[PDB]
């Protein structure tokens, strides 16, 4: 069984995830209309990304352990994990039958909509393949939330000053997920390793994203201030 | 372990040892290391160590059960991606914590400065030695190393794989076997096994860092030999 402390930890992540979701409804009426129209579609997409950044930041603050780290390590961990979490949340919003992604409650986007918004096929196709691979895993809410917490506290991120501390904070989340997947699905021993394998996939996708932001340079496209401070 | 799992592990361990025995034999074949125009000779020496490692990885993979049942194009594609990663996994294995040096082939030892003298960037060398010392903390033996490499080989998300579903299904028994082996080795250290898989996560970053190292060289117009050029640019 999960202990009282572990359940408290899990319920906190699940509940914080859901409250950050209710802060999608607040932003939706204030977003650039989807159509010079090409730049408006890029802006539209960058604003979605910024809504997601705000959500991620506000989630991290709620994750027990995060505010125990120094400010620089808080920044260093969020800078790396932001794209990985975005893609994870993107995968969760994917509809297998329509093959669209649904952002901010409604607003559905196809592969071609991603393209119309200025993104390249070298980046788009891995996103949709990762989206498809994630649906197949069929992660529940506690699984999703715990994977994100584990993702956040990765010690090998660039510019981490206290990787020993970061590694120690990840431990209880690794342990809770191990205990959870043992109780939830006793007859699937490989669920937990399979979940961790997706972090490997996410590192590759992050590298693919860096290439994509580099390609914006020559396309006469610029990241807005808040995205630029993380990705430029 | 089951009879099937233990035979598997023995197969991998014996392939790994036949690979290492060939590493030993190759020492007198290698261009000497020139001491303190002679940059180029150090770079070719290192280049030769990697060529040796490439064909050793090719030979190991053919011994990994199931790998020859994949189409040849996927075999090629799997190896093209994971070679850099298997090299570093092997580098880490030969890292000496006392001396802060790595032992290639039989007794050729190289420090951080030696890596820089052979023509590699600090951006790349630093992480190699950090991963090596990270690897030493988990205290992996021969079976665990051999299993992690086989797991590394069968990653379904590599570029240009035609049957990723088949690749993911061949990775399964290897993951299985490591989980059982690590639960039998340290029954009280649950978190050793997840930490080993996070190493594959670290290896993906390391791979991108290597693509930059190769890119930096293209910018200085200093070339890789055919075999490494084929795989890396
Ligand atoms: C809107 S939401 O429902 O809150 C949500 C949910 C999940 C993810 C999400 O963020 C998005 C949505 C669409 C695109 C991007 C995005 C990711 C990475 N790069 C981008 C870039 C660039 F850097 F140039 F490559 C430009 C424009 C958008 C992006 C992020 C929003
Ligand atoms: C010698 S051995 O015992 O067979 C052995 C053991 C373990 C690993 C191994 O492979 C090596 C050894 C030394 C260097 C490299 C290497 C890796 C990546 N890039 C390289 C590059 C470049 F591309 F320019 F960046 C140039 C030269 C060498 C390398 C690989 C060999």
How many domains does one find in chain B? 1
**CA–centroid distance, residue A187 to ligand 2 (Å):** 42
Chain center to CA of A153: 13
DSSP for B66-132?
Answer: TGGGS-HHHHHHHHHHHHHHHHHHHHHHTEETTTTEEEETTTEEE-HHHHHHTT--HHHHHHHHHHH
How buried is residue A217: exposed, middle or buried, by Cβ count under 10 Å (0-12/13-18/19+)? exposed
Please report which ligand is nearest the Cα atom of B102. 2
Report how far apart the first and last C-alpha atoms of chain B are (Å, whole number).
42
Residues pairing with A101 in the sheet: A94, A109
> Dihedral through CA A54, CA A55, CA A61, CA A66, nearest 10?
-100
Give the number of other Cβ atoms within 10 Å of residue B218's Cβ. Answer: 11
Method: X-ray
Of the candidates B175, B190, B205, which has its C-beta nearest A178's C-beta? B190
| Sign of the CA dihedral with A231 first, then A155, B178, and A145 last | negative
Note the Cα B90 to chain centre separation in Å: 4
Backbone angles phi, psi at B110, to 5 degrees: -135, 130
- CA distance to A86, B47, B191, per residue, from A223 (Å): 16, 40, 40
DSSP B156-205: TTSTT-S-HHHHHHHHHHHHHHHHHHHHHH-TT-TTHHHHHHHHHHHHHH
Query: How remote is the C-alpha of A77 from its chain's centroid?
Result: 13
- Name where chain A breaks: residue before each gap, C-N > 2.5 Å: 35
Number of C-beta neighbours around residue A120 at 10 A: 15
The answer to whether B91 touches B132, Cβ cutoff 8 Å, is yes
User: How far from A99 is each of A44, B13, B138, B157, CA to CA, in Å?
Assistant: 20, 44, 42, 20
Question: Under a CB-based contact definition with an 8 Å cutoff, are residues B102 and B132 in contact?
Answer: yes
Say whether B146 sits in a helix, a strand or coil.
helix
3-state secondary structure of B60: helix
Terminal-residue alpha carbon distance, chain A: 45
CA A32 to chain CA centroid, nearest Å:
23
Contact A91, A134 (CB under 8 A): yes
Residue B172 is nearest to which of A133, A190, A210, comparing CB atoms? A190
Q: Are A27 and A51 in contact (CB under 8 A)?
A: yes
Can you give the residue range of the structural domain that contains B143? Answer: 1-233
From A41, A49, A228, the mutation candidate for ligand 1 (largest count of ligand atoms within 8 A of CB) is: A49
Q: A118 and A138 in contact (C-beta within 8 Å)?
A: no
Q: How far apart are CA A12 and CA A82, in angstroms?
A: 20
Q: Which two tokens stand for residue B188?
A: 């009280």
Vertex A220: Cα angle to A217 and A226 (nearest 5): 65
Sign (positive/negative) of CA torsion B50, A205, A137, B191? positive
A131 within ligand 1 shell (Cβ under 6 A): no
User: What is the rounded distance in angstroms from the CA atom of residue A162 to the CA atom of residue A146?
Assistant: 22
CA distance A38 to A221: 10
3-state SS record for chain A: CCCHHHHHHHHHHHHHHHHHHHCCCCCCCCCCCCCCHHHHHHHHHHHHHHHHHHHHHHHHHHCCCHHHCCHHHHHHHHHHHHHHHHHHHHHHCEECCCCEEECCCCCEECHHHHHHCCCCHHHHHHHHHHHHHHHHHCCCHHHHHHHHHHHHCCCCCCCCCCHHHHHHHHHHHHHHHHHHHHHHCCCCCCHHHHHHHHHHHHHHHHHHHHHHHHHHHHCCCCCCHHHHHHHC
Token couple for B233? 């640019």
Gap between the Cα atoms of A101 and A107, Å rounded: 8
Instruction: For Cα atoms B189, B192, B194, give the angle at the middle one, nearest 5 degrees.
Output: 125
In angstroms, rounded to a whole number, what is the distance separating the alpha carbons of residues A58 and B46? Answer: 48
CB atoms B197 and A193 under 8 Å: yes
Contacts of A201 in chain B (CB under 8 A): 157
Interface test with B, best of A133, A134, A155, A196 (most B CBs within 10 A): A196
Phi-psi region of B221 (alpha: psi -120 to 50; beta: other; left: phi over 0): left
Cβ(A12)–Cβ(A65) below 8 Å:
no
Distance of CA B20 to the CA centre of its chain: 13
Which residue shows structure tokens 């691979």?
A: A133
CB A112, CB A125: distance < 8 Å: no
What is the number of alpha carbons within 13 Å of residue A192 lying toward its C-beta?
25
Identify which ligand lies nearest to the alpha carbon of B215: 2
Name the burial class of residue A26, with classes exposed (0-12), middle (13-18) and buried (19+) by CB atoms within 10 angstroms of its CB.
Answer: exposed
CATH at A60: 1.10.565.10
Measured between alpha carbons, how far is B77 from B97 in angstroms, rounded to an integer?
A: 34
**Sign of the torsion angle spanned by Cα atoms B214, B218, B222, B223:** positive
Dist. CA A22–CA B46, nearest whole Å:
56
| Calpha distance B15→B1 (Å, rounded) | 20
Are A189 and A165 within 8 A, CB to CB? Answer: no
Distance CA B63, CA B57 (A): 10
Could you give the 3-state DSSP secondary structure of residue B35? coil
Angle (CA) A52 B211 B128, round 5°: 95
Distance CA A18, CA A69 (A): 24
Q: Is A154 on the interface with B (CB under 8 A)?
A: yes
Contacts of B155 in chain A (CB under 8 A): 200
Q: How far is CA A191 from the centre of its chain?
A: 20
Q: How far apart are CA B120 and CA B136, in angstroms?
A: 23
């Amino acid at each position: 069984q999960l202990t009282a402390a572990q359940e408290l930890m899990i319920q906190q992540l699940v509940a914080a995830q859901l409250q950050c979701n209710k802060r999608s409804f607040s932003d939706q009426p204030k977003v650039t209309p989807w159509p010079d129209a090409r730049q408006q579609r890029f802006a539209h997409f960058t604003e979605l990304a910024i809504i997601s950044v705000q959500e991620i930041v506000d989630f991290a603050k709620q994750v027990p352990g995060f505010l125990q780290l120094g400010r620089e390590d808080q920044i260093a961990l969020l800078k790396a994990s932001t794209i990985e979490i975005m893609l994870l949340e993107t995968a969760r919003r994917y509809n297998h039958e329509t093959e669209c992604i649904t952002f901010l409650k409604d607003f559905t986007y196809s592969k071609d909509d991603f393209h119309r918004a200025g993104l390249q096929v070298e980046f788009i196709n891995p996103i949709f393949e990762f989206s498809r691979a994630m649906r197949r895993l069929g992660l529940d809410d506690a699984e999703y939330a715990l994977l994100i917490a584990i993702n956040i506290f990765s010690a090998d991120r660039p510019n981490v000053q206290e990787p020993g501390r970061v590694e120690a904070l990840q431990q209880p989340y690794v342990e809770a997920l191990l205990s959870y997947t043992r109780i939830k699905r006793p007859q699937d021993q490989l669920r937990f390793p399979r979940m961790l394998m997706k972090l490997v996939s996410l590192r590759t996708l992050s590298s693919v994203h860096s290439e994509q932001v580099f390609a914006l340079r020559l396309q006469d496209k610029k990241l807005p201030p808040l995205l630029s401070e993380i990705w430029d």
